[PDB]
Amino acid sequence: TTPSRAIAVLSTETIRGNITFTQVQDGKVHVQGGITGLPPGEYGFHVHEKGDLSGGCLSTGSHFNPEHKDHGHPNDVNRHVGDLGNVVFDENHYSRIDLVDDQISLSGPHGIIGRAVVLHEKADDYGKSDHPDSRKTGNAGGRVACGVIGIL
Amino acid sequence: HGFTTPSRAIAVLSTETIRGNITFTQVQDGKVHVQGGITGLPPGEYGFHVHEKGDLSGGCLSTGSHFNPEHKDHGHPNDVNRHVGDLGNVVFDENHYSRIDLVDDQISLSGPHGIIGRAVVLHEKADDYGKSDHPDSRKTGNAGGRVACGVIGIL
Ligand SMILES: *[C@@H]1O[C@H](CO)[C@@H](O[C@@H]2O[C@H](CO)[C@@H](O[C@@H]3O[C@H](CO)[C@@H](O)[C@H](O)[C@@H]3O)[C@H](O)[C@H]2NC(C)=O)[C@H](O)[C@H]1NC(C)=O
Ligand SMILES: *[C@@H]1O[C@H](CO)[C@@H](O[C@@H]2O[C@H](CO)[C@@H](O)[C@H](O)[C@H]2NC(C)=O)[C@H](O)[C@H]1NC(C)=O
Ligand SMILES: [Cu+2]
Ligand SMILES: [Cu+2]
Ligand SMILES: [Zn+2]
Ligand SMILES: [Zn+2]
Numbered sequence: 001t002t003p004s005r006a007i008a009v010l011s012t013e014t015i016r017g018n019i020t021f022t023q024v025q026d027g028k029v030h031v032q033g034g035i036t037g038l039p040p041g042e043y044g045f046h047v048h049e050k051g052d053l054s055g056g057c058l059s060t061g062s063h064f065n066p067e068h069k070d071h072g073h074p075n076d077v078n079r080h081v082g083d084l085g086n087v088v089f090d091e092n093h094y095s096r097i098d099l100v101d102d103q104i105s106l107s108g109p110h111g112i113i114g115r116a117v118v119l120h121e122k123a124d125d126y127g128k129s130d131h132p133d134s135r136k137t138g139n140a141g142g143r144v145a146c147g148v149i150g151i152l
Numbered sequence: 153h154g155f156t157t158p159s160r161a162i163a164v165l166s167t168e169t170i171r172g173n174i175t176f177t178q179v180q181d182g183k184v185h186v187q188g189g190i191t192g193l194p195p196g197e198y199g200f201h202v203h204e205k206g207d208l209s210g211g212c213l214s215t216g217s218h219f220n221p222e223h224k225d226h227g228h229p230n231d232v233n234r235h236v237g238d239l240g241n242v243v244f245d246e247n248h249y250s251r252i253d254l255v256d257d258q259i260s261l262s263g264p265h266g267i268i269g270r271a272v273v274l275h276e277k278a279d280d281y282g283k284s285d286h287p288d289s290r291k292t293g294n295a296g297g298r299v300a301c302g303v304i305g306i307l
Contacts, residue, residue: 001264006206007207007209009208009209011208018209051304052306053162053305054164113269114306115305116305147208148302148303149269150207150208150269150304151206152205
């Protein structure tokens, strides 16, 4: 029995959130969640390759990228498996997540169980700016919280 | 590119009082070498298990019960009648430090005994290996409350 459901918990002095992943549709994952703790705006949100928190958010590695593609927008053909775009915090510093993705999976080569979700300091530019980092990280800046993706 | 490198996993414990890293590496004939160090408890022995869910949303409770895909009873890690998650007790020294170093033949990094995405849980007291008369013994080892936990992630 491969899992049908997964969860990542973010927990910092300033940030608390749960992000759940449920395997739905035609090989699709439904990502739902809520986070508090950041001012209104958009913040890079990705599945990074490693669920190693021994060096904090930094040891989670880079964006999960088994297909060896470039950084892009989740609607692009050319993107990392772990590119889920940005999350949005509303004026009460709350973010609801409710999205559907068809690259990430709960099993197989695109499996994310054991990996990390990382919430970033600023907005992901989806691989579409002149900025030097754009094509690898989306210039989303530093890592503010991460949590290992565990079986739910 | 150097040598290619097989699958490992790691769980981190991190509390106001307790800190550790636990690493899992597959060795000969499919067994798992578990190693690492934890600091923060007085000299003694303490239950240490893989619990079924890697769900930390309600702290250590939401990790569920001992990982038990074969539906056995709680036992000693050297028993056949044990949960896959029954790694036993870890020992702390006079310096409040515990060196973990063991090989386990039930857990795996994949398959139906696969522990990736599951949780390691350190308990407030010793595991009695299901051998006592206390009502929780054959389920939990009477190891008590949960002092720290971590999701087992892909290293
Ligand atoms: C297990 O987790 C620990 C979490 O810290 C990692 O170990 C290392 O801890 C040392 C000890 O303090 C740190 O490095 C230090 O740097 C200073 C210089 O700034 C030096 O004076 C100290 O003597 C010490 O060497 C550091 O936070 C951390 N080092 C790293 C990231 O390698 C460790 O990585 C984990 N081990 C695993 C999972 O392999
Ligand atoms: C993360 O999940 C935890 C654990 O469920 C949440 O705390 C619970 O939240 C639910 C609904 O928000 C409530 O029914 C309860 O108050 C809490 N648990 C129990 C057992 O009563 C927490 O709210 C979640 N965080 C976010 C922001 O989604
Ligand atoms: Cu990232
Ligand atoms: Cu336990
Ligand atoms: Zn990316
Ligand atoms: Zn048990």
